[PDB]
Amino acid sequence: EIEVDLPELPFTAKVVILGDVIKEAVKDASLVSDSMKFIAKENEFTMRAEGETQEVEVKLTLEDEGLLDIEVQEETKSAYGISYLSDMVKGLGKADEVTIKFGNEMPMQMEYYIRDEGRLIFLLAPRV
Amino acid sequence: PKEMEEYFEMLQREIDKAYEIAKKARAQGKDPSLDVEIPQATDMAGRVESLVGPPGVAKRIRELVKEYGKEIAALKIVDEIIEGKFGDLGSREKYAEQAVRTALAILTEGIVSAPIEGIANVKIKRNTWADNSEYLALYYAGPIRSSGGTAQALSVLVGDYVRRKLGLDRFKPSEKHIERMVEEVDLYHRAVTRLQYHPSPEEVRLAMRNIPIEITGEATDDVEVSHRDVPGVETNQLRGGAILVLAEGVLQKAKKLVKYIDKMGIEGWEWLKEFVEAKEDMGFYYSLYQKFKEEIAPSDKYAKEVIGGRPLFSDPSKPGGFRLRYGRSRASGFATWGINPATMILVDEFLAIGTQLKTERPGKGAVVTPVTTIEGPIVKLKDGSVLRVDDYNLALKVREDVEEILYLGDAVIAFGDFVENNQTLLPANYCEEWWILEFVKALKEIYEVHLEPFTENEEESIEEASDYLEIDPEFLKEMLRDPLRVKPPVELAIHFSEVLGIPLHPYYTLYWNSVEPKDVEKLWRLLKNYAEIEWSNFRGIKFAKKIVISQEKLGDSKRTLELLGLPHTVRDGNVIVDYPWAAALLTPLGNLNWEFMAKPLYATIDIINENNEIKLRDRGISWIGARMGRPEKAKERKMKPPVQVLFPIGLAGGSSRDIKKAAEEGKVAEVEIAFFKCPKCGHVGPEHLCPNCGTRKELLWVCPRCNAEYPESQAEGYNYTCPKCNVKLRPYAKRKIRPSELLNRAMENVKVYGVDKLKGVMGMTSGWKMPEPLEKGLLRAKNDVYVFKDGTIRFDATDAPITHFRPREIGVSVEKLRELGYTHDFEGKPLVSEDQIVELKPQDIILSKEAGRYLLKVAKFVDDLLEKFYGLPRFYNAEKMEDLIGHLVIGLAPHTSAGIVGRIIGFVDALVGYAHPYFHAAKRRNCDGDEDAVMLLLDALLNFSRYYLPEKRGGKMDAPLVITTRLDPREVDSEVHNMDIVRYYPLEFYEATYELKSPKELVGVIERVEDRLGKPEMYYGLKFTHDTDDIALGPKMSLYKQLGDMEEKVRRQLEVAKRIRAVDEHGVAEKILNSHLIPDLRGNLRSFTRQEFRCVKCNTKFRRPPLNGKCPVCGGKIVLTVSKGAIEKYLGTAKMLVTEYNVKNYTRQRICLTERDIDSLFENVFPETQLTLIVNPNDICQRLVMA
Amino acid sequence: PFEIVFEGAKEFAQLIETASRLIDEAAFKVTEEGISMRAMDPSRVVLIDLNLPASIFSKYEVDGEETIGVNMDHLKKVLKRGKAKETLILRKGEENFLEISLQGTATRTFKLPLIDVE
DNA sequence: TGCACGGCTCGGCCCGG
DNA sequence: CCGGGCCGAGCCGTGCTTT
Ligand SMILES: [Mg+2]
Ligand SMILES: [Zn+2]
Ligand SMILES: [Zn+2]
Ligand SMILES: [Zn+2]
C-alpha cells in the first residue's frame, strides 16, 4: 500500500462534454500529432493538435450539442500527452457526460459517474 | 601538487563508500560468492599480479621498473621466474608458460587480454622430419585477432627469448610447410578478411624460414587447405589465429619490433632489421607549388571505394575542398578534426557531431567536432549572389536557395597528428594567428614596444603602442586578447600594412592564386573601362566603397569573381560589390594605377607583390580530402535476442524464451542446470538459500557415468572423482524444473506481480551452468533494463576528447562546481561566472542525455534491488538525470579485461562520450571512431560474477576483472604522448612549413605531453589553440539514419556531390558506386545456380532438392537460400546511375547485359505472360541496342 | 478560392479509396463543370479516369480552373475519418494548403499540404 | 560487419454478415 | 455482436565481382 492524495486545486476553466466527441478528437490528434492542446475561452471550447507539418482544429460552443455548459474564470490553455489520453478516453460511451477541469500548465482532471453514485477520476499531468 | 592529491583522495573516498555497501550486501549468501569479485588496483604491477600472477611479483616488478625501465625489467622478471625463486611449479612447459604470460602482461601494461585469451598453450615439439631436435610452439586462439600488432610482436619476441633461455633448438620447417602457409594466407585473404595488409610471398617466406618458433594453433574457420596431411600439424583447416600473429605482428610492425629488440639488447633478429632497412626567372609561389607537388603527392587510398548513401566530400587535394589549419581546439586533438557547424548544415546534415570520416593526409579516419572560430563555406545562391556563411543561423536561413558550394570550409588538425603518422609538413595557409605574430614582431622592431598575444599586457606598453599607431587602447587590448574574433576595419588593416610593413589582414585577402593572370588581366580591363566606383579617404589612404558594373559588359568574367570568393549581388541587371569587399578587390590592384599584365612562370600573387606596395600572402595553398563513414552512436547494449535474466529455459518458452509464458501454461522444462542441497533438511534445487530454513546450501557434484550425487564437502575428500568409477565429477547435470513454482516463489519474494514478459536464455554457456536469481530478473523487467553476459548493464557510445569546458555548456551551476572541487579557471582567476573556461580533471566525464536517460533507469533498478532483495537503504535517490552528478562509473573497451573509474559532472545534447584524452588512452583507445561502454559502479559491484562468464575461450574479454583507481599518464598509451599543449604555435613553425620539413625536425620547438612526463605537471596545466562558443552546437543526428530505400540514399548522395564544386560527381562518383552494386549483382546471379536448399523446420541443408518435393525425415517444405528477389534488388538504382550520368561504355554494356542475363535465366519458369498498355519506360538498354 | 459541399462523406471516401488502390499520386482537375482525374499505375497496366460534374454536388463554386495535387494515403486517411451522414466540405484560399472540414455532430478541419506532380 | 530479401508465428484491430 | 483477414512485430535463415 502506498498512500497518495491531492488537495482540491484551483480550476479556472470547467467544461462538461460527451464521450464521443472527446474520443474522436483524441483519435484525430493521434492521427496527426503526438500531443494535444486544450484551449478554452468564454463560451468556447477548442482543442488543437499541431503535427510536424499538418494541423487539426476542433472547436465547439455552448450553443453546439457537443458541450453542455462552460464557465471560464479567465483565459486558459495547456498541453498533455496523447498516449495516456487515448488509454483513458477509450471505452467511453456515446451517451455519457464527462466533466473536465484544467487551468494553466497544471494537471487536468477528468471524471464521470457510474450509476449516478459511483465515480471514476483521472489526474493527467501536464507537459514541459 | 596538492589539488591533485586532494582530488585522488576524494575519488578513493567515494570508491570506498560504494565498496562497503557492496561488501555488506554480498555477505548474506544470496549470490554465487560471499564477497565482491572485482579487486581494485593502483598501478601496472597490481594489474599484472592480479591478472596473471604469480603472487608477490608486484614488489619485484616495481623495483625493477624504477631501476632499469620497462623492457629490461620485463626480461629480468622472466629470468627471475625461470630460475624459480617464487616457488616450485613443475614441468619445463609450466615454467615457460608462466614466464611468457607474466612477461607479456608486463610489457603491455596489463590492460589487453592477450596474455590470458590470445595465448592458449605453449608446448615443446621435436623436429621429427629432419633432426628430431626440440623446439617451442605457441598456440594462439581467436581473441588474438583483437590484441594489436604490438601485442602480437611482443608475444613472438618474448616466446623467442624464453625458448632461447631454455636451451631449445631453432624451428626448422619443410618446403611443404612454407607452401601450406602461403596457401593459408591466400585462402584467409580471399575467404575471410582483407587483413588490412598483405605481405608478398617472398617476405612471408623470409619470415617463416627465419622465425625461430612454431606459430600454430587450433582451427578457427570452415575452410580446408589442399596441402593436406602436413607432418606435425593436427588439423587440415584454416588456423587464422596462427597466421594473424605472423602477418600483422612481426611482419607489419617490423620497425617498432626491432626498436624494442635494440632496447632489450637481444640479438639474432638482424635479418628483420635488414628487411626494415631495405623497406626504407620564376616566381616564389610558382616554384613553391612545383616543389609541393613534387614532394607531397596526392593520395587516393581513402577514396578507392564509395558505398551507397555515404557521400564523398572532396577529391584528393583539390582546391575548393577542406582548407587545412594547424591547431587544437578545446574538444579536439587526439585524432579528431574541428569543423564549422555551418558546413555540417549546408551538406544536408550528412555530418553530425561525432560522425566519422575517412581522411587523406595525416591519418586515415577522424571524428568531427564543432569549432565556431574558423571559417565556413562560400555559397552561390539561385539568383547569382555570393555569400560567406560563417554563421550557424545564417546557414539555417539561406539553406534553401543554395545552388553551389564554391568553398567547403576549414579543418583544424593538430600538430601532434602529423608527428604520430610521420607526415611531411604541408605549407600553411595565411591566418590570423600568423598575422598577429607578424604584427607584434614588426611593432617591436620598429618602435621597441613589447607585447604578447593571447594574454594580458602591461598598460604602459598598450598606451605607447596606441599613441604610436593612433588608435583606441581598448581596441588594441581587445584585438590582442582574441585575434580570431576581433578584426580591424579594412581601412585600419590597410593603415597597419602601410605603417608597419606587413601583409594584408588574411580576412580581406581573396583567393588570388585560384585564377590565372590572364583572367585577372581581362577583369582589370573591364573594371578600368566600364565600371563606376566611389572612393573614400582615411589618414591619406584612398579606398573603394562600391563598384557597379552591368552584367552584359562584365560578360564571362563573372566566374572570376565567383572563384575569387568575392561577395556581390545582382540587381536590375547590375552586379554590385559593397563596402568591405570593394577595397578587398581594388587595393591589391593598386586602385587601377598600374596595369596588370600576365607573365610566364609567374602566379597572380607574384605579380601583385612585384608591382604593388602592399604585400599579400597565399590565403589558400593546402587542401585535404575526406569521405563519410560510420555515423555516430549513443545506444544501449543488448544480446542478439534480448535477455533480462541469466536463467536457462530451453524451448519451453518459445522463440522469445519467455519464462513467464512458460510458467503460466504449467509446462515442464528439461535443461542443464546446477542444483544445490541444504545440509540441514535436504531441500534440492537451483537456489543459494533454502526457503524453509534460509541457510546457505552446497553445490552438488554428479558423476556422469553412474549419476551419483555428492555434496561439496564430500567431493572435496574424493578429489572430485567418483569412487565407484575413475572419472571426474561435474557440477551440473541435465535436470527437470517446473517454472511455475519457482516464478511464484520469486514473485512473492520481491512483491513484483505485474511483469508481463521475462526473457531468459536457451542454455548457459559457462562451465558451471549456475543460474542467476529470478528476483533480479523480475526487477530488471519492471524497470526496463537488460543484462550482459557477465551480469551487468552497459551503454555504448562514441568517444571524443575534451580538456577545457564552460559551466554553461554542460548545464551545471558554479556553486555545484565549487562543491565538486573546481575553484579557479584555466588562467588562475577565481571561478565566479558561468562563462569562464575551467580545466577538466583527468577522471571527470561528460555524458550525453541518452546515457543519462538510461542510467536513471539503472539507478532505479539498483535502488529497488537494495531495498527489496537485500533489505538495505537506497543509494542513489534520483528523480532526474541531474541527480547522478558526482557518482562514479566504469569505462571498459571491448578488447580489454581491466576498467577505470570515472565521475559524472554534466550532460550535453550530442551522441558522443566526452572525456579527457588520458581517460580514453587508459582504455587503449584512439578516439577516431572507437566506441566504449560505461556502467554504474555499484551495479557492477553487486551483480558481476565470475561464474557467469562463457568458457569458450574469450569469455574473459570485455569483463572488469580488475579496475584502476588512479590514472598515471606514464603508462596509459603511447599515441597520446605526441599531443601538443601550447597556447599557440610559434613563428618558427610557420616559417619552417614553407620548407616542407618533417615534424621530427621541429619536435623540440612545440611542447608535447612527452616533455612533461615524470614531473608533477602532467595533470596540472595543458592548453589549447582555438576556442569554441559551444561544444554541442550543430546537427545531432546524421541524415543517413532517416533514409529508407537504397535508391533514395543514392539520389541524396549524388545530389550532395553535384552541389559541391570540388567533388566531380559526373562519372567518378557513379563509377565508384557501380563498383559496389555490380559485385553484388554478379555474385548473387552466380550463386543462384549452385545454391543449397534447406528445410524450414530443421536446419539440414541438401545439395539438390528431393524428388518428392518435401523434406524426408521431416514434416516441412523445402525453401531457397538465394531468392529471385535477392539478385535484382539493386538493378533499378544501377540502371538509374547508368542512364543519368556519364559513365564509360564498358560499365553501361555490363549493366545492359546483366539485365538480359537475369531475364534470360528465368525464361522457362516465369514466362512473360502479361502484356502492357504502354512501353518505353525511358529504357537505356533498348535505345543503346537500337542505335 | 472555391467552396465545394458534398453530402455523405462515406461515399466520397469509398470512391477515393477505390481510385487510390492502383496509383499513388494524382492531380485533380477542377473547372466550372466538375472535377476530373486520370492517371496510370507504375506498372503501366491500368489506366483510371474519373469525373464528377457539378450536378451531383449540393453546392459548387469555382472561378476559372486549377489542378490540385496531393498524396493519396493522407487524403484517404482524412476521408476515412468521416462518418456516414456528415457533409464533406472542400475549401481553399490563396495559400496553397488544402483545408478539409467535416460538419456533422461537430465541425473538425484538417490541413493537408499540397504537392506538385508531373 | 551493416545492410537487402525471404519462410513462419502471433496478437490487435477492424469490418461486414 | 462474434468471427475471419489483414497487417505489423519479432525469432530463425541466406547472400554480398573471380579467366
Ligand atoms: Mg581507433
Ligand atoms: Zn533447508
Ligand atoms: Zn561414478
Ligand atoms: Zn526437414
Short mmCIF file of C-alpha atoms in Angstrom, two decimals, chain A residues 26-79:
data_model
loop_
_atom_site.label_atom_id
_atom_site.label_comp_id
_atom_site.label_asym_id
_atom_site.label_seq_id
_atom_site.Cartn_x
_atom_site.Cartn_y
_atom_site.Cartn_z
CA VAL A 26 -8.17 12.32 -29.40
CA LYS A 27 -8.17 9.90 -32.33
CA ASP A 28 -7.62 12.75 -34.81
CA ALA A 29 -4.85 14.30 -32.71
CA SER A 30 -3.11 10.93 -32.57
CA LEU A 31 -3.58 10.71 -36.34
CA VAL A 32 -1.75 13.99 -36.93
CA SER A 33 0.34 14.88 -33.87
CA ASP A 34 1.71 13.24 -30.73
CA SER A 35 0.33 15.76 -28.19
CA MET A 36 -2.86 17.75 -27.70
CA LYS A 37 -3.60 21.28 -26.50
CA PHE A 38 -6.72 22.21 -24.53
CA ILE A 39 -7.74 25.85 -25.06
CA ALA A 40 -10.98 27.27 -23.67
CA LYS A 41 -12.40 30.80 -23.69
CA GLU A 42 -15.69 32.49 -22.81
CA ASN A 43 -18.44 30.24 -24.20
CA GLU A 44 -16.00 28.44 -26.50
CA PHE A 45 -14.01 25.21 -26.12
CA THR A 46 -11.41 24.23 -28.72
CA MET A 47 -8.76 21.51 -28.86
CA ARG A 48 -5.87 21.54 -31.32
CA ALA A 49 -3.15 19.13 -32.41
CA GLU A 50 -0.25 20.57 -34.41
CA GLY A 51 1.85 17.96 -36.20
CA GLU A 52 5.23 18.35 -37.82
CA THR A 53 3.53 19.82 -40.91
CA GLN A 54 -0.21 19.07 -40.70
CA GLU A 55 -2.82 20.72 -38.47
CA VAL A 56 -6.03 19.69 -36.69
CA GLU A 57 -8.54 22.13 -35.21
CA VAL A 58 -11.71 21.20 -33.31
CA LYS A 59 -13.81 23.96 -31.77
CA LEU A 60 -17.18 23.95 -30.03
CA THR A 61 -19.61 26.37 -28.40
CA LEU A 62 -22.27 26.05 -25.72
CA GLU A 63 -24.81 26.60 -28.50
CA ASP A 64 -23.47 23.36 -30.01
CA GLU A 65 -24.77 19.96 -28.95
CA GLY A 66 -21.32 18.65 -28.02
CA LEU A 67 -20.96 20.84 -24.94
CA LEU A 68 -23.40 21.09 -22.04
CA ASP A 69 -22.03 24.19 -20.28
CA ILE A 70 -18.89 26.24 -19.72
CA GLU A 71 -17.59 28.58 -17.02
CA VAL A 72 -14.16 30.13 -17.60
CA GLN A 73 -12.67 32.19 -14.78
CA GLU A 74 -10.01 33.52 -17.17
CA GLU A 75 -8.00 32.58 -20.25
CA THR A 76 -6.65 29.02 -20.05
CA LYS A 77 -4.52 26.69 -22.15
CA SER A 78 -2.28 23.65 -21.64
CA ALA A 79 -0.92 20.53 -23.35
#
